[PDB]
Amino acid sequence: DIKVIKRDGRMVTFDSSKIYEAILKASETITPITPLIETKLEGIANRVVAEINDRFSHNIKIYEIQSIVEHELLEANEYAIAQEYINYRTKRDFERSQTINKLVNKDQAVVHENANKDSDLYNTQRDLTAGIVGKSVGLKMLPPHVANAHQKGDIHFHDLDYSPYTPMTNCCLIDFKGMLANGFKIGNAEVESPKSIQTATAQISQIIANVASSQYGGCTADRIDEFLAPYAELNYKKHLADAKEWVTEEKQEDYARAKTRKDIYDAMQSLEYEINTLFTSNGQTPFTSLGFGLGTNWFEREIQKAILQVRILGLGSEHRTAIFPKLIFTLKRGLNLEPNSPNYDIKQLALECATKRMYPDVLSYDKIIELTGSFKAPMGCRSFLQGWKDENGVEVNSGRMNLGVVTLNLPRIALESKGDQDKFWEIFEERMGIAKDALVYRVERVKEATPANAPILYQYGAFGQRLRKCDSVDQLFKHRRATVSLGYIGLYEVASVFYGSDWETNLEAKTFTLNIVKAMKNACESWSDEYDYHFSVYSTPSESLTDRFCRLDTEKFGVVTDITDKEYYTNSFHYDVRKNPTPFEKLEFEKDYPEAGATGGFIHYCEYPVLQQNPKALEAVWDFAYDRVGYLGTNTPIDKCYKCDFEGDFTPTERGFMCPNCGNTDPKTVDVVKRTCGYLGNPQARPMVKGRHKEISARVKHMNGSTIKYGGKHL
Amino acid sequence: RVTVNPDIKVIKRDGRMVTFDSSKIYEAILKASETITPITPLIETKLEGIANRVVAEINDRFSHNIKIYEIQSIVEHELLEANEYAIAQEYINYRTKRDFERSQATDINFTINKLVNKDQAVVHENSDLYNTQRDLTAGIVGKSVGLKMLPPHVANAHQKGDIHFHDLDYSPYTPMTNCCLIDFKGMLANGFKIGNAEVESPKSIQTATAQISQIIANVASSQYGGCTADRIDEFLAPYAELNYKKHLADAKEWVTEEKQEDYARAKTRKDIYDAMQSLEYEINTLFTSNGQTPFTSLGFGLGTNWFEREIQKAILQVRILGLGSEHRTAIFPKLIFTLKRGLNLEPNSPNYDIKQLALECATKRMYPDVLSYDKIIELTGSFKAPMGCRSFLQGWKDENGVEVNSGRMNLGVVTLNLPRIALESKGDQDKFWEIFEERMGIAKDALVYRVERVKEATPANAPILYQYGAFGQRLRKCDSVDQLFKHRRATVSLGYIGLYEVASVFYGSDWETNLEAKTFTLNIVKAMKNACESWSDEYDYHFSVYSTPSESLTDRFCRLDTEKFGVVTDITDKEYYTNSFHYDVRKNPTPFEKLEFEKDYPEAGATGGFIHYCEYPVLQQNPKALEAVWDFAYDRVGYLGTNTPIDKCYKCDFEGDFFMCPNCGNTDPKTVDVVKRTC
Ligand SMILES: Nc1ncnc2c1ncn2[C@H]1C[C@H](O)[C@@H](COP(=O)(O)OP(=O)(O)OP(=O)(O)O)O1
Ligand SMILES: Nc1ncnc2c1ncn2[C@H]1C[C@H](O)[C@@H](COP(=O)(O)OP(=O)(O)OP(=O)(O)O)O1
Ligand SMILES: Nc1ncnc2c1ncn2[C@H]1C[C@H](O)[C@@H](COP(=O)(O)OP(=O)(O)OP(=O)(O)O)O1
Ligand SMILES: Nc1ncnc2c1ncn2[C@H]1C[C@H](O)[C@@H](COP(=O)(O)OP(=O)(O)OP(=O)(O)O)O1
Ligand SMILES: Nc1ncnc2c1ncn2[C@H]1C[C@H](O)[C@@H](COP(=O)(O)OP(=O)(O)OP(=O)(O)O)O1
Ligand SMILES: Nc1ncnc2c1ncn2[C@H]1C[C@H](O)[C@@H](COP(=O)(O)OP(=O)(O)OP(=O)(O)O)O1
Ligand SMILES: [Mg+2]
Ligand SMILES: [Mg+2]
Ligand SMILES: [Mg+2]
Ligand SMILES: [Mg+2]
Ligand SMILES: [Zn+2]
Ligand SMILES: [Zn+2]
């Protein structure tokens, strides 16, 4: 290892952190450290070490290290941190021997957190430029008042990187049943109907990879155990015919049964791994959901079991938690909910999986039907289609899509209200009109698409009906077949402005938040009659919005107590994550909001401790939730550090998450899984924005218990 | 007066190694001083004393080369040692100003705002998928940024059409590499991380081929060129053997002892076919950010045992059968079959049955192309399949004396517009070699730049390549990627095109029979070979002569020359340039005549990339005729591709070469199967 020559002459040992901490001090003079800046600095620090060993062999001087640090800062295009580092380092060199320049424009004086030349994948880097062009051109395509409201922060026009630059749609339920049945053309090949479940799960992932790049939202395989089971019956028939030729007569049925079991497991094992190797143009994996649970026969049951035990096993030899696809298990009274039900053994398997992998989320078969008019898994994260029938009276769920999302900054309306609820509704009506204009423009823009733009969607069965190149894409959107999302956020903050930080026990406060949801549902019903598309109230995931709205409102209104001071906004109608109600009180409080009109999109979370050796505690919440809420997710500490074998809940810091036992943050040797919003995420692999990270750090547990499964060893 | 170590060379910012020149240091210090006070003899004495301390420190801190910023660091250091704080302040301020402005030429936010507003150009060509439409804007930005990053004389040469700097959409904006031979054998044996999964070694051939298609997808997004699975029948065989091992174990529990061996054999043969079927269909459903299928190749043929033979047959059987119910011809991956005397060449050879199958496949489809095992060894120093289209690695032993082929890559291509040089000569070969020497130097500056650019890549920019085995050795995040490029490990491509047009300028249309006309074209290849060998000794990367594929480059050079020189007879009047050294496409020599004429050019030094095309009417639907060409080619050329298959109209059921359809006139690509070579 190379030694370092100090300025006085003595030789010290190469301490790599002296480079990082130097760069850190220069960055902190511009803006406080964040998880995103942390990985940016660590990547730049690695390049410095690389250049040092590439340009020097036995020793290196201090000023030689300084010239590499400044050189690598300019090679990474970090002009703001470089200007600070160079001026300070130069000032100290002049002082030891006895500002220097200004060369950065207003837009380069800020640290760009989502752009790391030394850390990002190539396709991530090039797609970044496509998104900048797309957003810039897209802002001029919008109606100017809609574009102005987005820029100010009154509303949020979602997915500007993709829409309206392209007439892309949002999310959808892929009609896998129709596609796999008749075959389809994908890429250069036009495959035929699969003759086994292995070929079927292979075609599914290839369909997902294609759908993921024809739309800016997620996609779901609804009732996968049911449409996959016929292809697993082909496997049984195969193995049964093979048993006639080779196997003893007394063993032919056990042979075909045992081989088909392994085939089903291998097919779902392939679906798990292949989805985790797929990626869109930005380098990130596709946002995918698998829904299952309503199958009853042996093949449908085995597919359910194989999905869960694959997720339980984990990815690779380290058995890491699979973040994608999202698994959604359907609970149904009489099928798997009661201990006497035939599929109850699968419910106990899904309970084991949720205590080890957080997934699966659970749907209430009946409550979903009541809230949304029919049963289906949510499109992507949490978007629900409403009950809809075709011209022949046939119920149609899979094959339907969402056309776009626009979200209202509700806390802003409360902060502009100055404690006057009459002024709140006055501003609320104005903001609703802007959102209506934005949503109508989205519908017009998506209708300008052509079947040739996304053949997998419009021509080969993903949207249910196959169109010709001459047909209009609106044929699959009109008559309320497609949905349009009117989003919102921060009902807690809206109530805190008028009723204080402990309004949850105030009925008049609760009524206010419920009347806001009903008002949005009322307008959506009116818009749905005006334009004959299904507008619905959507509980927007706070993955990026919680930071953007809180950041823009802090500039406009300052540090408002309980609102902007915490640096995040509470998601939709959710309970204040800082308070600690029981999971039973939480679901009883929140259940009123989807019933009031928030049915276009919704979810419920609960924070548990380590539940791996206590699944019945989780089962009491699922059973309690069946009659009250439709979509329930389970959060439980399932992190793991592979340096000291610690398992539990990592301690959040200003830079991300570190091991509570040894302080390890290296994502190569830690498995940190947190619920971003609906989906799970790896905050050590892809760090979240500061606001999203603050909201995650503010979450308290809802039932007592230990957040440590394995304490770890002393290193 | 201190003398610099003569073993030290200055590495310019664009990668060029130049002679050390202490006057460059003195003049720099002088320019900073003149901004403060006029020069005086007393100041000169101080400035040349400082320059001496700079050269002494250089000799004290570096042994072989030194970068520009390392010299500047010493200049600023010694200025502060000499207590010339006024000069040092002016020098640092000016040097830092130029360093920032130089980095801002790679900034997107500056140029994207200009692209959408005022001065930057968008339409620069002289497509329905959304990801294609979004990728167009990424390439517009990349080409606009890339042109400002290149050395100015390289950019001017490219825009004028004197050279072609390949893949401006991707490099130098990103430090991406070009093509490679993926080291599948190392990845599959030791496991690897891909996406979010740290997968283990495959326990079956079905899992092996599934991991291959996913590796290919991830590699295809980490580079702008093709990738190749070399000797796929051989490294897949150990995984097909695992299928046999577990089938024989199941046979012991379910099958009677008399049938146990036949059970494991039959099931394993089916598993092999199913696995290769998946590889075929999964490759065709892959796509890069532009929506196109990644260019991929499978090389196979040298396997001998039962498992290797079955993998070869399965590959050819799947390709023969076609894609889908209509049995369309699969264009990707390219199949490259290895002929070898004693293994499958002559009718008595053990694998001759596979050659017969390959001949049937190449006739009914287009692929497999064939490689002469012996000729490739003679031309490239060792045996390996071409990376991507036709890029060949040279024979290379690693630091442990082991021959390495898979895991190596090409760093970029720059193609000389040779027909233009001939037209600029005005009939005088003396001016040709004069202009040829100049264009040669410009291409050298561009290739040196590409190597310097790809070395800026970090392992984290492409973990599948640098960290998880695609390039052989696995690097850490704090290592340099150059470890996998240097010591001639990676190749650099010097391209050319249009030897027919060049000779025709000085010798007329029918020069092929002129002995001195061919000697001239062969001297052009030899001049390129010798230059590349010299560049390889200078920079320690393998520069090689590359017969650039025509693609769209043959239209860019011809279109730009038509604007510059007009309609020249036999040159630009046909609206295309003949590829590299190939025989005139308008002339119709026999396959044996064509191969005898063309074999000299790889032998002359065009070995970094080459292929031989034969399009003879007798070869259509005639496996016997094709075998005559393969056999004749084995001892003469190294890489041969035969006829394209008949274009099929699925309506009206016509077969021919047609675009429209002679029997009806259909143009719908859904009911039409047209097969063309990508390169
Ligand atoms: N042991 C070391 N290993 C690697 N880099 C080092 C080491 N010590 C110092 N550096 C580098 C990192 C910075 O680029 C540069 C200045 O860092 P700094 O910690 O202030 O060093 P220093 O020698 O001035 O120490 P101090 O300020 O504590 O006296 O020196
Ligand atoms: N306030 C700051 N602004 C910008 N960069 C800073 C700041 N503080 C520290 N740094 C960076 C640049 C310094 O070279 C490096 C090491 O810090 P420091 O020890 O203060 O400086 P130094 O090593 O140049 O001088 P010295 O050791 O003589 O104090 O950290
Ligand atoms: N891995 C794959 N990915 C995508 N398509 C595939 C894959 N393997 C096969 N296909 C295509 C080829 C056919 O057009 C269609 C049916 O495949 P498959 O179920 O393997 O039937 P098959 O006709 O090859 O019969 P079998 O495998 O049962 O002998 O799917
Ligand atoms: N051949 C060389 N020998 C020694 N030092 C050199 C050489 N070329 C450049 N330098 C050093 C001297 C200065 O400290 C620094 C910048 O000098 P300069 O002549 O402007 O280089 P350059 O590569 O930027 O060229 P130019 O500005 O002419 O294009 O580089
Ligand atoms: N006007 C000046 N004031 C101060 N120092 C100067 C001035 N002109 C030149 N120098 C010094 C510092 C420069 O690094 C060095 C070489 O000059 P110059 O080639 O113009 O700069 P450079 O090499 O940093 O940039 P460029 O990228 O344009 O080559 O001489
Ligand atoms: N279709 C697939 N695509 C990608 N990786 C896969 C796929 N199937 C399995 N893998 C991964 C999982 C393991 O880490 C590794 C080995 O897979 P595999 O050979 O199926 O082993 P295994 O442990 O599942 O045993 P077996 O299949 O014999 O029961 O590859
Ligand atoms: Mg210091
Ligand atoms: Mg397996
Ligand atoms: Mg200069
Ligand atoms: Mg098959
Ligand atoms: Zn630890
Ligand atoms: Zn026809």
Numbering used by the authors:
A (entry chain B): 14 to 111, 118 to 734
B (entry chain A): 8 to 133, 138 to 669, 676 to 696
Article, verbatim:
Ribonucleotide reductases (RNRs) are essential enzymes that use radical-based chemistry to catalyze the reduction of ribonucleotides to deoxyribonucleotides. Anaerobic class III RNRs (NrdDs), the subject of this study, use an oxygen-sensitive glycyl radical cofactor and are members of the glycyl radical enzyme (GRE) family. The activity of NrdD enzymes can be allosterically up-regulated by ATP and down-regulated by dATP. We find that StNrdD’s regulatory “cone” domains adopt markedly different conformations depending on whether the activator ATP or the inhibitor dATP is bound and that these different conformations alternatively position an “active site flap” toward the active site (ATP-bound) or away (dATP-bound).
An x-ray structure of StNrdD bound to dATP was determined to 2.6-Å resolution by soaking WT-StNrdD crystals in 10 mM CTP and 10 mM dATP. Two dATP molecules are bound in the cone domain of StNrdD as was observed recently for PcNrdD and discussed in detail below. We find one dATP molecule bound in the canonical allosteric activity site (site 1) as first identified in EcRNR. The most unexpected feature of this dATP-bound StNrdD crystal structure is the asymmetric arrangement of the cone domains compared to the dimeric protein core. The cone domains, which form an antiparallel dimeric unit, are tilted so they contact only one side of the core fold, the side of the NrdD dimer that contains the opening to the chain B active site within the 10-stranded barrel. The chain B cone domain sits close to the top of the chain B barrel, not only burying a relatively large surface area near the barrel edge (525 Å2) but also making contacts with chain A across a chain A–chain B interface (left side of dimer in Fig. 2B). We find that the chain B cone domain is near the opening of the chain B barrel but the cone domain is rotated, such that the C terminus end of helix 4 is pointing away from the barrel opening (~180° away), pulling the connector in the opposite direction from the active site. Here, the C terminus of the cone domain helix 4 is pointing in the correct direction toward the chain A active site, but the chain A cone domain is sitting on the opposite side of the NrdD dimer from the barrel opening and is thus too far away for the connector to reach the active site (right). The asymmetry of the dATP-bound structure is therefore part of the mechanism of inhibition.
